[PDB]
Design a protein around this ligand. Sequence first.
Ligand SMILES: NS(=O)(=O)c1nc2ccccc2s1
Ligand SMILES: [Zn+2]
Length: 258
Amino acid sequence: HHWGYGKHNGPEHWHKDFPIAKGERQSPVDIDTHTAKYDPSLKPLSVSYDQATSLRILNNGHAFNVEFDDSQDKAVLKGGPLDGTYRLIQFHFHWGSLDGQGSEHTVDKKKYAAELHLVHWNTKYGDWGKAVQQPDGLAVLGIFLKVGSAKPGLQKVVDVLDSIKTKGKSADFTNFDPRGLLPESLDYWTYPGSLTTPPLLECVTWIVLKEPISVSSEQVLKFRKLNFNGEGEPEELMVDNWRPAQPLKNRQIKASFK
Ligand SMILES: NS(=O)(=O)c1nc2ccccc2s1
Ligand SMILES: [Zn+2]
């Protein structure tokens, strides 16, 4: 892998190493709120994070992942458009160099300052590597961030970032409660899509919450002090690590709410 979000290895180049980048169910997409159809057959989402066990936070050179113990059913996502049980494996964000961009999904072409991805895999496939080979292998819960009032539940994440500034650095990150990152409402849009970084596999049921969370300018400024580069290498600020909207093609975006 040599892909990134720089001036010569960005999303417009990915198709050369990952031809599925030009596929029929790529993510993210623009959510046209007037075209998305209310589906009364969709169920309430069930976000069961009471027993979540966070373990570690890693700068992987494209974002930072907060990793969970997914060795058994602790934190799981069920219901909504989903059949079966999906285990939380990690969350990460995508963000911008300034507040007017950062999100991957857009809403009537509006870009949010950032987007949180809570990533889950379908336990019926036994492990992540098997799950990503299946069209219903993953469920990613996407939550928009706008800049305003501080999000108290995000501050523990913010405060550890200085310790994982560069690619390949990690730190212990136990006892973090991801419920503190959820908005009030679980109203959502859903559509079939893909991973938004290589390998871009078309194995995701996307669930994107309508209600954004508010974070402070100071919180997102700390995201923007991270580095894409490794220790001692020329500093490249980790900013604009988002893939733009991809063609919707023959896909329907459904709303859980009227
Ligand atoms: N950005 S995302 O679709 O949530 C995502 N992409 C990837 C790629 C490789 C491994 C895990 C994930 S999770
Ligand atoms: Zn993501």
